[PDB]
Design a protein around this ligand. Structure first.
Ligand SMILES: CCCCCCCCCCC(=O)OC[C@H](COP(=O)(O)O[C@H]1[C@H](O[C@H]2O[C@H](CO)[C@@H](O)[C@H](O)[C@@H]2O)[C@H](O)[C@@H](O)[C@H](O)[C@@H]1O[C@@H]1O[C@H](COC(=O)CCCCCCCCCC)[C@@H](O)[C@H](O)[C@@H]1O)OC(=O)CCCCCCC
Lengths: 625, 516
């Protein structure tokens, strides 16, 4: 029988080979990486089928491989917990990563080192699988830092470009801040509960106190901000787009960003008992949703706009998760639908960039609808899913999240619902702007660009991603199949129904329509300008990512450099200064004493006659003085 | 029973003597003989470890003989889990350093042509003295070799090494020797106190006897005298293991010495300091160590953060690595002095992992520096394009020093941090900031050196940066393999470390705090 850990072994081993075989595997390495990803997908599907063939607690698969860190009371044993929640992430990650690998075959076909790129992709998939499968928070941390490393490597690909290297470094550092927060969380968990595994943690979760649980939840939320790119750690997404488009697709659709939401939901027991932590998570989700929606409207680059949209969607998912069990299942469903349609959108954007001679500016593109019919269709399907057309997948998930936010009740519920509605409207506006500037209007192409249809290898993944963006949302929402599936592990909940569901759906549709009409008037009725138009202070602020980078450069880069200079000065002048002063004192005293060696025999005789000092000392020894 | 530890520590010294006695014309044969001696020492260490039973008595392979009864010191060897870990580290590393420094002594002239023989003999002598210090179960014997090991390393830095080698060697030897002399004051005080106590027949240096006497309570001593003795021991070990602010000697010696010698210093030699804290400071003076725990914990945390910041601020690659190592010793001492099973086991495993990781990173940086002619970080750029393997191995080593979970150091750092939090949460958080600072000073250096457009003269010119030669791969691959193995499956190390740590904590009346 196939053990669960194969899911991790198949990709990682592939990566290992692709990393060690080197040039010998450069000709066929991508094939091996794709095969490893596909095998992981097959194993995940088989495990999901086995879980379906089981009922109740038998659905989840818990498997402890070996004792890992048996130090005193820690006794952490490496183990995987493929539960109803874990299997959904496993399937999403494996399928989307396999599709992205297939797409990368063609996307990286003309670029050397494709074998190394696929090695990094396989390592990324293995890290994500370990993150979602680990039955304890220490294995979760292992997968977490592995995902961080893989994101650094992939974003850092094309190392000859300084921007790519800087983006990789920034991504890893921001991820590592959240990792440090999660490390504080684990230390608190061990100190208070004495255990790190999910089972023991959640068994002891009811104890401790509101303050301790809130601290744990807040640190986990910081970690998620690190991964999920929530404020204030949301600044690294924009620069990460310097990497290959498949990297952006994989990061935003699954694994990297999905990790924060997975951490929040898997930690559901803690947040349920920590209302203050849930409030913090909700605030972060709403704020980052609004910030990403605002930033996206200004980005003139397809990659940057897609990154802002991903940030906004992750914010919506985070708000749903922080809403407690009422939104946890809806959060997971929206995460899956986002994986699908965001991956489709990123693949379409990569196809456009490849056709546009790697052009990334949305202003240069235009009227591509006829130029790339397959890419246009895939991008439009993902666009409909993201906007949330009733047939599209995103419609059901976003509607459920908004309904939960509104049903949170009171001032908090009203604020969350208003934030969600504004986010939906801004998302519609930004996505419509991007789509119109890309596929509609005059060509605006430059440098004699000659767009061509993407090959079948990059195309089939696009069609499958569009099919997912069309179907998965309904397939999961209609009848509450996903909600019932997550019920046994995720906290069950009833419906408050603060407002009629049809009312919320109509409001969402009206907001989306208003945004679409505004975007059409701005960029469809009015020809798309070829240059960045001026605008209100808000427009430039969004163009600068709401100064999010500048703040980081203003506070931490500058403050960090100040602290570094201060410490270097302390080392060179204070710490080393004490030893230098000691040496100077010794040398000065040595010179002074050497001056006593006058060289005159009579001076030496005087020093000897100083033996009067010895005489007086001996005499006074009895004088008691 | 065969005197396994005696052979273990004697073989390096005898091999050094033979190597230095070889004629000048046998330089290559001298290198091979030194490597063979190192491999024989590694085999001896392997058999000792295999025969070592972690479930058995605390000390094993014990050899005991009368050496200087007049001083109350005996030739007593014996290896515990803590000692065995460092012994294995030293034994495995020394051959790798030898094959790394294969040609480091080639350009040195004079010395009757014994430059290669002298370098190899000094390295082997350092290995032997470090090993005997690790296995010694007598305070005076351990002090003798803890201080003696400085001289071979002092020669190894001053001889060979960079232009400023002389000043660096002087600063090294004088810092460490001032500390060792303070240890001598403390050791003589310990002898005097033991002589004045009825617990022993006379002034004694048998570590086991003194530890048992203090633990049982028979050897009660005035807490002020114990505090002073502990202060002397801790000061000596703090200069040896670069505890902040006593670190200032380490950067110059590490940068000026050859990469193999610098690694031997920081990776292997300096560990004897931290190990010294773990075996003696805590067990000879449990009361004084407990009393001073706040101060030493604060110093270790400040060392972590301060060394990380300085490494961020450095412009020389090798000096950056040296400050990284200073911060890592900060972690080691923090884990040692928190007096927690998790903390101490993590600190020992960290000694191991840091030895390996610093060896790998420093040796790779040394290879790169040799390829070019400058240690300046800004002097490089886009090195990944020209030497993919060199850049990849450097990245892996940095990730190890960065404490990724997939690599060994994280397991230790985590374990240390965990242990620190259960007793000093604020100190734990302050140290945890080093997780971010390490990402900074590793990845920024990687960005500055290996990424971006290929800097002039790196891929072309008279001194292009060619990829690693097979010998450098022989050096690097084992270190990366150990990092990966101890990251994925650290248990084999912990199984040895955990018992010894428990015996240590049991000895000092300390226990892991019960969870809330
Ligand atoms: C709790 C602790 C939190 C502390 C986290 C802070 C981490 C360190 C911040 C600085 C950094 O993280 O590192 C930047 C430099 C090297 O700067 P770089 O040279 O690498 O790149 C520059 C670029 O210069 C060129 O760089 C190459 C060519 O040289 C090209 O590719 C580029 O296009 C460009 O032309 C460009 O011109 C310069 O204006 C920029 O400074 C470029 O960096 C820039 O940093 C900025 C900051 O980033 C961060 O994550 C900080 C935020 C992370 C945490 C903040 C919020 C967390 C709150 C939690 C609640 C970003 O806006 C981008 O990250 C951008 O990239 O390190 C240093 O001095 C370190 C000195 C001391 C640091 C010690 C800190 C204690």
């Amino acid at each position: 029988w196939l053990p669960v850990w194969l899911l991790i072994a198949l990709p990682a081993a592939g990566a290992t080979i692709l990393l060690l075989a080197g040039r010998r595997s450069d000709r066929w390495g991508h094939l091996l990486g794709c095969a490893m990803s596909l095998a992981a997908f097959a194993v995940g599907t088989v495990l999901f089928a086995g879980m379906l063939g089981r009922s109740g607690e038998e659905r989840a698969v818990h498997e402890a491989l070996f004792s890992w860190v048996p130090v005193g009371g820690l006794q952490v044993d490496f183990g995987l917990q493929l539960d109803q929640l874990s299997v959904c992430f496993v399937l999403l990650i494996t399928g989307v990563g396999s599709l992205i690998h297939i797409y990368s075959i063609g996307y990286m076909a003309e670029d050397p080192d494709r074998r190394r790129f696929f090695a990094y992709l396989n390592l990324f998939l293995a890290a994500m699988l370990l993150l979602v499968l680990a039955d304890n928070y220490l294995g979760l941390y292992a997968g977490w830092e592995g995902v961080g490393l893989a994101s650094y490597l992939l974003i850092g690909f094309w190392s000859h470009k300084p921007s790519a290297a800087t983006a990789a470094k920034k991504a890893f550092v921001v991820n590592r801040v959240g990792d440090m927060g999660l490390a504080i969380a684990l230390m608190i968990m061990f100190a208070t509960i004495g255990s790190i595994s999910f089972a023991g943690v959640f068994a002891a979760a009811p104890g401790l106190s509101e303050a301790t649980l809130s601290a744990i939840g807040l640190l986990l939320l910081l970690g998620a901000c690190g991964k999920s790119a929530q404020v204030p750690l949301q600044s690294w997404l924009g620069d990460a787009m310097e990497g290959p488009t498949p990297v952006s697709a994989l990061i935003h659709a699954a694994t990297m960003v999905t990790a924060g939401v997975y951490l929040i939901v898997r930690s559901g027991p803690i947040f349920d008992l920590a209302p203050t932590a849930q409030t913090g998570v909700v605030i972060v989700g709403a704020v980052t949703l609004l910030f990403g929606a605002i930033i996206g409207c200004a980005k003139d680059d397809i990659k940057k706009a897609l990154a802002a949209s991903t940030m906004s969607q992750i914010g919506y998912m985070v708000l749903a998760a922080g809403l407690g069990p009422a939104g946890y299942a809806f959060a997971i469903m929206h995460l899956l639908t986002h994986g699908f349609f965001k991956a489709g959108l990123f693949l379409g954007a990569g196809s456009v960039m490849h056709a546009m001679n790697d052009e990334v500016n949305m202003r240069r593109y235009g009227g591509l609808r006829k130029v790339l019919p397959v890419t246009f269709a895939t991008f439009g399907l993902g666009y409909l899913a993201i906007i949330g057309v009733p047939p599209l997948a995103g419609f059901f998930s976003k509607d459920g999240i908004i309904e939960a936010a509104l049903g949170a009740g009171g001032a908090r519920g009203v604020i969350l619902g208003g934030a969600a509605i504004l986010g939906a409207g801004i998302t519609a506006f930004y996505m419509t702007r991007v789509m119109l500037m890309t596929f509609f209007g005059e060509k605006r192409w430059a440098a004699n660009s000659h767009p061509h249809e993407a090959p079948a290898v990059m195309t089939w993944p696009m069609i499958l991603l569009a099919v997912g963006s069309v179907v998965s949302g309904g397939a999961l929402a209609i009848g509450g199949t996903l909600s019932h599936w997550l019920e046994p592990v995720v906290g069950t909940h009833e419906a408050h129904h603060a407002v009629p569901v049809w009312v919320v759906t109509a409001i969402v549709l009206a907001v989306v329509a208003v945004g679409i009409a505004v975007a059409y008037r701005m960029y469809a009725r009015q020809a798309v300008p070829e240059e960045v138009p001026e605008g209100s202070a808000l427009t430039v602020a969004a163009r600068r990512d709401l100064y999010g980078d500048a703040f980081n450069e203003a506070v931490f880069m500058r403050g960090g450099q100040t602290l570094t200079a201060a410490m270097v000065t302390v080392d060179d002048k204070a710490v080393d200064g004490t030893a230098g002063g000691l040496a100077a004192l010794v040398s000065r005293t040595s010179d002074a004493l050497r001056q006593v060696q006058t060289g005159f025999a009579r001076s030496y005789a005087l020093s000897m006659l100083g033996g009067s000092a010895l005489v007086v000392a001996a005499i006074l020894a009895v004088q008691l003085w | 029973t065969f005197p396994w530890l005696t052979v273990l520590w004697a073989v390096p010294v005898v091999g050094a003597a033979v190597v230095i006695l070889l004629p000048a014309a046998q330089q290559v044969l001298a290198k091979w003989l030194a490597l063979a001696v190192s491999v024989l020492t590694l085999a001896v260490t392997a058999v000792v470890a295999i025969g070592f039973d972690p479930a058995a008595a605390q000390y094993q392979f014990v050899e005991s003989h009368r050496w200087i009864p007049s001083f109350g010191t005996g030739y007593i060897l014996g290896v515990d889990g803590i000692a065995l870990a460092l012994v294995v580290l030293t034994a495995v590393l020394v051959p790798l350093l030898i094959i790394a420094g294969w040609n480091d002594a080639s350009r040195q002239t004079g010395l009757a042509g014994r430059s290669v023989q002298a370098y190899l003999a000094l390295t082997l002598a350092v290995e032997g003295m470090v090993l005997m210090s690790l296995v010694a179960l007598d305070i005076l014997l351990f002090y003798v070799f803890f201080e003696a090991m400085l001289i071979p390393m002092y020669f190894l830095i001053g001889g060979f090494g960079g232009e400023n080698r002389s000043r660096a060697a002087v600063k090294f030897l004088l810092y460490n020797l001032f500390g060792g002399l303070i240890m001598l004051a403390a050791v003589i005080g310990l002898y005097v106190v033991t002589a004045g106590s009825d617990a022993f027949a006379a002034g004694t240096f048998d570590f086991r006897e003194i530890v048992a006497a203090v633990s049982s309570g028979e050897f009660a001593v005035n807490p002020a005298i114990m505090n002073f003795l502990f202060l002397g021991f801790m000061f000596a070990f703090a200069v040896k293991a670069p505890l902040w602010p006593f670190h200032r000697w380490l950067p110059d010696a590490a940068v000026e010495a050859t990469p193999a010698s610098a690694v031997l210093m920081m990776a292997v030699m300096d560990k004897v300091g931290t190990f010294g804290m773990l075996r003696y400071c805590l067990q000879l003076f449990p009361d004084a160590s407990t009393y001073f725990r706040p101060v030493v914990i604060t110093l270790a945390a400040i060392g972590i953060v301060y060394g990380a910041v300085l490494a961020i601020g450095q412009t020389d690659v090798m000096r950056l690595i040296a400050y990284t190592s200073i911060s890592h010793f900060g972690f080691i001492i923090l884990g040692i002095f928190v007096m927690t099973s998790q903390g101490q086991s993590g600190s020992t495993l960290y000694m191991i992992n840091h030895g390996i990781s610093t060896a790998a990173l420093f040796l790779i940086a040394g290879f790169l520096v040799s390829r070019r002619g400058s240690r300046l970080i800004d002097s490089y750029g886009g090195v990944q394009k020209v030497a993919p393997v060199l850049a990849g191995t450097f990245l892996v080593a940095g990730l190890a020093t960065l404490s990724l979970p997939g690599l060994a150091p994280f397991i230790s750092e985590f374990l240390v941090l965990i242990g620190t939090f259960t007793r000093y949460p604020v100190v734990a958080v302050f140290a945890a900031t080093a997780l971010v600072l390490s990402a900074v000073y590793i990845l920024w250096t990687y960005q500055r050196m290996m990424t971006g457009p290929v800097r002039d003269g790196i891929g072309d010119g008279d001194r292009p940066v060619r990829d690693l030669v097979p010998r450098e791969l022989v050096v690097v691959a084992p270190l990366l393999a150990l990092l990966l193995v101890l990251g994925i499956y650290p248990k084999p190390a912990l199984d040895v470390i955990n018992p010894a740590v428990e015996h240590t904590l049991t000895t000092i009346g300390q226990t892991d705090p019960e969870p809330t």
